[model samples]
Target chain A: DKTVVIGLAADSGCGKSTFMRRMTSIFGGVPKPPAGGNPDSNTLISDMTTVICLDDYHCLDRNGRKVKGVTALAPEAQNFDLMYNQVKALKEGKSVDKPIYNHVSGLIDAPEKIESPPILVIEGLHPFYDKRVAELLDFKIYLDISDDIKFAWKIQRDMAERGHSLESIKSSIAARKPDFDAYIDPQKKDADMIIQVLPTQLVPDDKGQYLRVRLIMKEGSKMFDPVYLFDEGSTISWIPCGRKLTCSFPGIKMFYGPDTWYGQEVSVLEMDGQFDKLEELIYVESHLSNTSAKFYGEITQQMLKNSGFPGSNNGTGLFQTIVGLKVREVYERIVK
Target chain B: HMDKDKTVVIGLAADSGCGKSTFMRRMTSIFGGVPKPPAGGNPDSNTLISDMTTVICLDDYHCLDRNGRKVKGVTALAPEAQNFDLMYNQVKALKEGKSVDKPIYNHVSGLIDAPEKIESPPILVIEGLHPFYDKRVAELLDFKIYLDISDDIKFAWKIQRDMAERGHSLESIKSSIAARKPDFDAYIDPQKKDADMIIQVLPTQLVPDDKGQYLRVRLIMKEGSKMFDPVYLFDEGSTISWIPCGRKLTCSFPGIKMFYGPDTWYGQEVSVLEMDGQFDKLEELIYVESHLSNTSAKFYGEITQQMLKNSGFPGSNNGTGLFQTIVGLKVREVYERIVK
Candidate 1:
């Protein structure tokens, strides 16, 4: 059987790992690092799906890039031949000896053999960049976060985990800005679904924690119907029924309506402010028509009850729904 | 010849003096071919017969002719003045790919004329004050549009027509409009809420206390409704002001301005494309200035200028822009649904 490819694209430190952790759990598997080789490899090998890091396709490793004076985000820095061949083989129920670009040593590591599975996830800044590889994907998702939040998260992670000074982190981000815009950001327009995270417009000074998430679902997609709040094709702004469930000071506000995103008409569902109690986040009913998440009827409750679910208080609900949709797509395709 | 069963029904609603004839003329012209009268029918009948398209006037369903309305002491705008049962049946039958023997109201004779037969075409247009007034009739429409003109413009148009055509005094026309205003608001204007698109024309706000020469026209559409995109001035969502024709077009006080943004209409998200000020010369090509990429005015915007230059109709620019855009959407919908 052919493996259905799911491509996730985002810049570094934009919660890709957190989303994958939840996704792997939903897929009901404990994926480990590449077995017996390349301990520095970020690839997650699993039974249900194999998540291939497009980072391995970097034609020039970090040191090589330093000598050549080019950032990793440039399209010329990636090897599309390897990416297309390996992904095509995997989708055809074959296997490949996938290469590894080690982040710790900043060098290319030994190749690791990867077997095919029912699902294959290719994640990186340029997962959708190569035209051949992009067309091969069954479902595509773009995690779009505002520059302010990306910068804040980058600084927080580098200062805490890597012990890098704030000045150095800021400089590193500035250096990659041009390439990121040119090669990475434009891919959002082509995505089937876009999960855009912006700082709460309500609380301007609030730095990082509180987030406003917008789930943009493109109309007329193959297997996806836009999630609406209560009514279809009507503009609705609703807070939950009661005070205990409702938010008082800039509580959860949801707006569902048809809007233009990147010149395409899409249904936009926006949640302003953050959830106070992650477990208490109730399920808001929606209009059901060609919906993909009928199996897990209530999304908020399902995510809240599952512990160790990262980004649950933020844009996790949106990401989970998308994963569920992809799973439904695969199930329908295989059965039919 | 087109298949009778594969017909697309469209509804166009507007008040009587709001230039519906001119709107239909431009619309049929854009759809191509000169529409003719029904074959072997009353030669003076208002219905235009065509193989590609058919225009049906709701005035045919007027239960009370002029004499009947005079006896009943009711204006034509009143819902009770129309025969909705016949209207609904006629529309419903046509949508189901059936022909109907529709009644004809004779304006010259001031009486109900003989019934005429109508067959469904590829595109069927129902233009009247109450195309969307009846619930069942409204449900049969694939697309609906409302032409909203300012009261001042309507008055000017009506005065000119009545004075030249019937030798009616200005005072009599004003009094008739006042009498019809209540029923017009009650029965007709509410149908605009059900429309997929609305072309709202008003007096320009740029000059204070000005008469209706320079108009501000807003094209409001139900977002994501298989219609065209809203024409933004510069950026897609961002607010910006632009003059497209630039110095090529002359201006006295205010030349042109546009505002495009997201708005809520009838509890639905809508895109509002508004153009303020007016052109000094109607014959001039509308030169558009915008920094935004992918504006929704490629075909309709170009055709509007050409229509204005040749037609010489009063307020032709606004009427053409609104009608051509609707026709453009109709063509696209037809191609996507029927042709393709």
Candidate 2:
């Protein structure tokens, strides 16, 4: 069949796009300018077919963020225009020279011809989201990375490589999250392959580190035995979120059953009758030994309230509004 | 290796449906043989190759897979580029007279299953949507030609071509248009200025009516070298020639203008390139360029103002510094061309 299309999904700054770019550098075919000068002497064939980052083909508005909320901006979002045309070109038995979205300048730097009958490899945040792409892919991969880790990576990348100050980086991360979740998260469920990239440290290169990806399932939907992820030299262990988990407790398969209940067992609140949607799905939605909602809410609210208002105090209203709604609710209903 | 011979790798590019393929086809036939092929894959179905020469169809090389889809790569690498290394190597080998395998792509199943062996071709002729869009690609080519057909004629050709051959219904094509057009502006059309030559195609012989001719019939490409030459075809009296080219052009007796896809009465007469030749026209063209500007909303405010000042504006009592106008103008051009 055709080359399998790969999808990378992560929160902003997880370096999904950057990671793919690096892979292209090492593997070749980042689609540089065509070989120029004397055609006969310039014979260092690029060594690989080009790797296009689909993230570039999205609609982008003024903030240089992919426009997510407004329908008007969808056409302009991250290189959606280039992505669509290139894809159409492919469907028409034509080669599509892929475009590059230079992130630093927030401009699409035009497309480079990708010689055909080519083997195309595309990776990006929402590669799986477009309904039209499903039938074309041989394999779909979802990369699971934490927002915290991704932000840390973003902080490092922007400051070190992209000429961004901590303040500006913080500002961008804060603005991009709501859209990432709304637009990107739902697409992960559609992936055929899910990779769990655990943080790994190199022995000598202290600053050099990488996330080693472990394929969750070699084949089929049946989950592999839960990966016993152990952070080196630490007892505080938690399975990475977004990596689908299934487990058993006592005599019951608590994670897999239609509901978390055993035969006759039922919730006290639902004694009068079954609330089909929530009650029936509660077991599916219920969580144990997880991060506290209040804890995350406060953490997020504080993150937003700080460094997010154009270096001014303009965002406190929006901050305090959330604090009032959920933080105050947590204090009233639980802490009190 | 006879490396002394100049490599004339020509890239014929423009917006879609601008007679690039036809022009290339004509060149292959006129040259008497196709250009050289890289060491792999099946022979190009149409052998435009000549004795000791072979011509490569960049468009044919870019055909979609058997499944009617782009082969995608993992993690954002364009799926089609998984084989990019091989293609590059083969092209390099073709240049070196070495043995290399040609790779085959399946259009029906979207698979790149195997390679077929072939001899290296000479005089490679590459033509595609963005062959010259990349600066690197431009450097690789010996010469690049841009075709500047009227947007109206281009669109008229596009509507017919896609409907007849591309599997796109007229309504679907129209519906998909708004979502599709920006790619041309952002990634394809902007590269036109970088070409070594830009040929403007005008209507040639109009189709006569036997209950069949319509607006679409009057827009076939003009023939021969004259089709691509920019030199004005003037008469013995030094008046503009009896060429019908001007009649097919969009007019702007009132003001300069151009429409998207350029196939409208308005776009035909505006003469965007002709105006670029005038110093006074530079001021007027700035106004027209303003209409065409598509910078990001965040950056547009500052750029739009600077562009106005640069276009010979003199509103305030105190004259603005030429340095300020110059700096702002340079930034304005860059921003307008490629803002996110």
Candidate 3:
């Protein structure tokens, strides 16, 4: 039973649950069962991976009620101890039970028995909110969505699925504002991988459901260049943002980058000449912020030279550092 | 000592079959005098003060059952369906001398109904694989105990419990046992090093049948003492168990790293809180998230002012002068606090 711990965090009503369902239709055979306590048996035979919802692990309040006297009731309130335990178990390569929650009943209906496989995707609002959880994960993804759209989608979703009124969901969202700041938003900083799904996503494969996304960055004057498109064949200059970013755009494979570069702003260029379509492509946000870039250009250079590695001596070495070493050390010696 | 008002807490933690709950029950009975039948002496009586005590079962906090697909147990609930913040919030409130509404997880029905109010008490006892896993929670604990049981004993007890109380078929239990090792290594065993005390319960001398049994059931807290030992000794079994789980959990951390260093030391605790705590403080120190340590209270207090300000909790009325400079240095705030 090979194990993998995966976390999916996003704002409520962002189609996180629906998106998980979509992950199922990707294969022609049986869809992978949702990982966690309540795995769908059919899913196990189909795809090797399983997707599970974190909603089933909620911790309750006294009054046989939810959303009562507690000051803040966020998804983080779920049985986190239990949740973290399960994740830790999965990290060890054991098959764990994925708990299943009945949305209509707000109760756990069944356990989804899941054997650990190479990949398991667990999605919820605060899956990545906790640090211990962040540590155990093989991969962590933050589902980026605009607050406005998230709220809009949430209203309709609550109305349709949970039998909530517009006013109720709105009020709940309002009530959760503090917790969102305290717990959810802060977690975004810890996101190792981010998927900023546009309001409409394109299915780039024959499956017609899986999202094929192209990540483009600007190198100086160009618009859309595949940021890491060149190395072996220089297919991509791996940006080690700590670990490798698995770019899922069509006509692409996989690569690794620096641990320091996760969630930072780096210029995305389509490289010298990898994919012609990738050339001149632009991205929504840059990896290096102005302040970060300033730190990198000024103080970061000398620190690299002093670290005493052979290649770290060059100006390009600063860029090269992002693909391999720990970002903390670089930030410590120089970024001040 | 018996003071004005103090909370009573009981923590129960151990490997699957170490008698943690049994020990806890014995202790509580000794201290508070457990009564049988329909008699309500005090909601929070002798040793436990109302609005001040709590019992946190770390096992109850299991994420999802590792073997989730079954009809029974809490695994039927989806991960997202679980409410985590509520769990912590209730526990926090209970710790704060406030009344708590406990979430009743209907074991038979496998549903967590809405919260019902449970009076908070003084002492808060937390036990589980991760009772002290979080830095903040660790700081809050007054006393921590780890239940140590030999592997053979633990497995035997687990089989007995699963068969007698948990009501499981032998086949299912066997499957679960097979799954337990990896999960324990990944999740449970790492935390053994964090426990404050290692209390082992063997029969003083083992029966002839127990030789092989106890081999699988080594002391629960033995790993911790060895990990913290100045003269580190590596048994072949221990060495083989280590993998690239993550250096953060297994690194040669400084004394300061565990929040056990000198008063001014900085380590993993500081980093843990910084990275896992409020972000506003990180920004105020002009630090990105990268500057955090895994454990350090000095770093925590330094960032506390900004954290208060950001959360509207309360902080520097003198403005951002100190905050700005801390960020300017890009180091932690401990240096300035010590210097001043």
Candidate 4:
């Protein structure tokens, strides 16, 4: 089946759910979770791409890390040997049963039957951190969320939904910091692209609320005709400070340049502010190239079509959709 | 016994007069309390103390005093002129919660004063020329902020400071700046890449044949840092511009223009907050929202909360004043997380 493997990491909360939805939108289909089989299953199946959780390869269950005194982000807790083999099996068109990691039930359920899809995305911790599993990925993406507001939502989920105390939740995230730095973050160094978020320099927003998203496209990657904003390799600082560009409340900003990330040259397309109108993208759309967009105004239509989608108004949605189109381009080429 | 394990070191590299002092004062306040020199120590002590934070001037690490540097034919900025071995060891000592007699560089005397007794603090801020120059010293930083003052703009700032007094000030500033140019660029300027945030000052693009009266300051904030969050202008990743001119706020000439976007510095990705031009009323900064779409933000009023702090400041409401104040607030946010 030659299943094209994609490795995604960082911000699994945002990356897994939103990316799954956008993945189907870009690849075209409805992604259905498992039926009665492990209703809490971490697998998503679409027409072309199937999303799987790397947690399924956890050598230990929920209590496993607790008893072992190792965090899930710790390499010792992961079943790398199984992870490498299952992905290899998927790549080779072999059908295999994938283990399910039940959340909070503190157990690793039985393996479920899985056939190959055109593309498979393994997301969780260490998609690229483990050298062996990293070798299986055909493409890689790493994402970061603006800490300013992301924390608020996270605390909301932990306190309101998970029923954890504020103090407990605080220590939980703060605890993740060390392991994230050592195991997860270092993985971004090997990514094909990175979607990094930051606070906006524009409005009433000083913190991370209004985001500035930079799409770091890996240079010299085969089959990766990375997207760029306006002129390539130039440090262009543009501002539609006035009427030169269309802006309503929040407005928008775009910066494009060439840079080095982890010893490799890269093209960076950064959009700090956002737009309310989907057509508002044309101001920037007119100048962009290599976005895997067909015909002029094609990307605008995709954005307009998914206008109701998550992050559609911000660069988070805008760039992810564009990347989804690029993934489609990559998949089609592989099929050909 | 293990306070060293809790030490958080911040790096501040600069050319000074670009609001380096202002930045420190901001940092000092963020960590809380007035910073005092060691008790009964060298009258020329260079270290400043607070409850949990200690500010160490890297000038103390200079092995060669002003006279020695002139004799050595090396500027103060040269690696050969500094005792980096002592610099690294002492910092390492402090991190390990040990006491050392830290050397003092007296600005008033242009000489190396006697060593002062130094103790470990929860947060240590190392500021001066070579903080980021040495590989051994650079890696110890929990956070780094670099202030880059343009050579011409700096000279212009000096000339104008005395212009209301200029042939003497003009020519004096010129040759002085010329003497330090090579060393500053070679050893100091390149260090911004290692910094978590860079306070960059350059001549204004708003006016042609303009002096440093109006300057452009960029807070080139590095992203994905463990101890710091880079400040963005309008958006997180996009390049954006905002001109707060019109009624509520007043602009005399080219007006207030800003550019914020993501940029690559050396080998890292950073979000840049660039502000150019001066505003008539610092409080009127809130007026910018009138022009902004109501939905984007009525933040000009909220801006007052931050801007209000600088209302009775000593400097103009120009790039330096605005940028420095913003940096101070961000540092406060970071220190809160760091100690906890």
Error of 4 at B149 (Å): 26
Let me know the DockQ for model 2.
0.00
Candidate 3 regions off by >4 Å? A17-46, A61-76, A154-169, A197-336, B1-340
Docking class of 1: incorrect
Give the Cα error of residue A263 in candidate 3, in Å.
9.1
Q: Could you give me the TM-score of model 2 versus the true structure?
A: 0.28
- On residues A266-315, what C-alpha lDDT tens digit does candidate 1 reach at each position? 88777777665655553443322334554545455457445565577655
- Model 3 lDDT, residue B120, Cα: 56
lDDT string for model 2 (B1-340, tens) is 5653323345656554444444453344333443444434343342245553454434334434443333342111122433334445555555545545554444344454455554554454455555565454566654565555544555555666567545466646553455445555555566565654444533323333222112211111111221131211111101110111122322223221111211122222211111111112322323222322222223433433443433433211111111122222332232233321
**iRMS, model 3 (angstroms):** 16.0
TM-score of 4: 0.51
Q: lDDT tens string, model 4, B12-33? A: 8987666677767655654457
The Cα error of candidate 2 at residue A49, in Å, is: 87
Q: Model 4 segments beyond 4 Å from truth? A: A146-149, A159-168, A204-207, A241-246, B1-340
The lDDT for every candidate, in the order shown, is: 0.70, 0.37, 0.39, 0.74
* Best model per TM-score: 4
**Tens digits of per-residue lDDT for model 2, A182-246:** 77666666654344333332122122133333333222222111111111111111221111322
Q: What class would a CAPRI assessor give candidate 3's docking?
A: incorrect
| Top candidate (DockQ) | 4
Error of 2 at B36 (Å): 12
TM-score of chain A of 2: 0.47
TM-score of each: 0.50, 0.28, 0.30, 0.51
DockQ of 4: 0.08
